[PDB]
Design an enzyme around this catalytic site. Structure first.
Site, PDB file in Angstrom:
ATOM      1  N   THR A   1      50.020  34.803  61.312  1.00 54.12           N
ATOM      2  CA  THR A   1      48.759  34.283  61.586  1.00 54.12           C
ATOM      3  C   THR A   1      48.689  32.926  62.441  1.00 54.12           C
ATOM      4  O   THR A   1      49.841  32.224  62.640  1.00 54.12           O
ATOM      5  CB  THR A   1      47.951  34.046  60.303  1.00 54.12           C
ATOM      6  OG1 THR A   1      46.578  34.050  60.867  1.00 54.12           O
ATOM      7  CG2 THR A   1      48.198  32.923  59.674  1.00 54.12           C
TER       8      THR A   1
ATOM      9  N   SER B   1      46.596  37.875  57.979  1.00 55.78           N
ATOM     10  CA  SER B   1      45.478  37.353  58.268  1.00 55.78           C
ATOM     11  C   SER B   1      45.022  37.422  59.953  1.00 55.78           C
ATOM     12  O   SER B   1      44.771  38.713  60.112  1.00 55.78           O
ATOM     13  CB  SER B   1      45.720  35.843  58.097  1.00 55.78           C
ATOM     14  OG  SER B   1      44.348  35.155  57.916  1.00 55.78           O
TER      15      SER B   1
ATOM     16  N   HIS C   1      46.243  34.947  49.459  1.00 53.73           N
ATOM     17  CA  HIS C   1      46.399  35.224  50.617  1.00 53.73           C
ATOM     18  C   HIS C   1      47.476  35.564  51.469  1.00 53.73           C
ATOM     19  O   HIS C   1      47.531  36.099  52.157  1.00 53.73           O
ATOM     20  CB  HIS C   1      45.607  34.186  51.427  1.00 53.73           C
ATOM     21  CG  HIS C   1      45.084  34.452  52.819  1.00 53.73           C
ATOM     22  ND1 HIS C   1      44.292  35.425  53.245  1.00 53.73           N
ATOM     23  CD2 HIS C   1      45.332  33.930  53.984  1.00 53.73           C
ATOM     24  CE1 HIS C   1      43.898  35.690  54.465  1.00 53.73           C
ATOM     25  NE2 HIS C   1      44.745  34.693  55.005  1.00 53.73           N
ATOM     26  N   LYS C   2      48.643  34.962  50.920  1.00 53.14           N
ATOM     27  CA  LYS C   2      49.996  34.845  51.272  1.00 53.14           C
ATOM     28  C   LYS C   2      50.910  35.804  50.544  1.00 53.14           C
ATOM     29  O   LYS C   2      51.752  35.377  49.631  1.00 53.14           O
ATOM     30  CB  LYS C   2      50.636  33.800  51.472  1.00 53.14           C
ATOM     31  CG  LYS C   2      49.974  32.463  52.411  1.00 53.14           C
ATOM     32  CD  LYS C   2      49.613  33.328  53.599  1.00 53.14           C
ATOM     33  CE  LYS C   2      49.970  32.045  54.929  1.00 53.14           C
ATOM     34  NZ  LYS C   2      49.350  32.740  56.266  1.00 53.14           N
TER      35      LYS C   2
END
Ligand SMILES: [Cl-]
Ligand SMILES: [Cl-]
Lengths: 261, 265
Positions: free
Chosen positions: B14, B83, B238-239
């Protein structure tokens, strides 16, 4: 027991960057230390390219600037890995009053009786197994400067040789072209007793380093005797990657030994 | 014992991040017998360009387009975008649909084919504004002023790498760079099409504990443009490639085997 907190500045070798210290920093910070890793010029995510410099003075500028920011009365412990040993010695020579101790982490450890290049020439003499690393050159001033881009086999087999395989991959995606600026290094004035020679020096080596051999490291230790020598069983050249908790234990002892009012 | 197709994954970071972020995942995919390549997009990771040299997604994505062009004729790849990397992989699928076997969205913006390419980003931007210590700036590119972001320490720790090892937070701190979503470009691009991006198998993977893309936002994306398959990874942030990499590798391998079974027939 007796424990103090110190400020460490952590300095990577050529081709590497502040990122290399990612495991060590939180361990030090957990124990109450301030630990600062920076990118030298054209290293890590620094936006300069290597062709824009040709000297250790230029290369080291970020370290010198940071040291100039330390408050009056306060000192730092410099930790240099591999070729970052040259940077921390240069810093000690320039700002001896700001540095409580030097920690050489499988690192080139210069002396005062020979040219600053002396230990690097010895390394270069004794290790030539560069495999898939790529050597190139560029012009800086009148000089042709030799640069290296570290190969995958060099990383996996010689440098990160007992590190997690994901660290080898991380390095693959981050290492950049680097130089030892040998022509500059070999023509610089010798380090001195009152500068670099005045600071407590600790030498830390990894038992299973596959690029700085045991004989080379013992040769450096005998060449310019340090104040203390630590050994880390099973550690490769990148102790801060392969045996980071053991490294942190040693740095805590160094802080305690460096401690003062 | 027999044979099956060994996939070639191309892994796309991202904005503000780089190829380095995929350091845990690559060895697992390679160990298992697949190929996995991660690259730096423009002005990202250790790419030497700086962000002010570009102002568009087409420019930003060039390294991915160049890679795809190098893939031999009749071979295909699986694009994994994390993302904002979802936009890059959608663009690549649109441009080279014949080279892509599947798209895997990894807590990623997943465009559709009936709205402007910015549609999902604009929704994200409405729905998440808690940017804490991240720093916004701008520069001029052509007639436009482009908004850029530098991710803050609290943003990284609390919103992005929120169930990741603190070492990974520190790693990110020393590597993240200024980035942009090039919103003015993105919102004026032609829509994706059914024959390009809209022709490729899409797999939507999300982390149960993502602290920047809401459960509601992720379900809003999934329902906006229904994918072929959905995976939720328990306890991932998120990761996913950092917090639950074992589980992510398993999912990717299952996606590759699904593409292997298609060829079998
Ligand atoms: Cl090294
Ligand atoms: Cl992110």
């Amino acid at each position: 027991g007796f424990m103090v907190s110190a400020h460490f500045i952590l300095i990577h070798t050529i081709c590497h960057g502040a990122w290399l210290w990612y495991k060590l920093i939180p361990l030090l910070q957990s124990a109450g230390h301030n630990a600062t890793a920076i990118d030298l010029v054209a290293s890590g995510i620094d936006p300069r390219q290597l062709e824009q410099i040709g000297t250790w003075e230029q290369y080291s500028e970020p370290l010198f600037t940071l040291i100039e920011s330390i408050p009056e009365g306060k000192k730092v412990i410099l930790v240099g890995e591999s070729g970052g040993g040259i940077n921390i010695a240069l810093a000690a020579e320039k700002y001896p009053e700001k540095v409580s101790a030097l920690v050489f982490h499988n690192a080139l450890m210069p002396d005062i009786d020979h040219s600053p290049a002396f230990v690097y020439k010895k390394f270069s003499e004794v290790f030539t197994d560069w495999k898939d690393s790529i050597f190139s050159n560029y012009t800086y001033g009148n000089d042709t400067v030799t640069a290296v881009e570290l190969g995958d086999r060099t990383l996996a087999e010689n440098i990160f040789s007992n590190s997690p395989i994901e660290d080898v991959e991380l390095a693959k995606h981050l290492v950049r072209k680097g130089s030892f600026f040998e022509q500059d290094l070999d023509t610089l004035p010798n380090f001195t007793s009152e500068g670099y020679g005045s600071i407590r020096r600790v030498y830390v080596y990894g038992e299973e380093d596959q690029i700085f051999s045991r004989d080379f490291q013992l040769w450096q230790i005998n060449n310019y005797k340090p104040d203390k020598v630590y050994c880390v069983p099973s550690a490769d050249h990148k102790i801060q990657i392969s045996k980071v908790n053991e490294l942190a234990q040693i740095l805590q002892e160094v802080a305690n030994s460096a401690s003062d009012l």
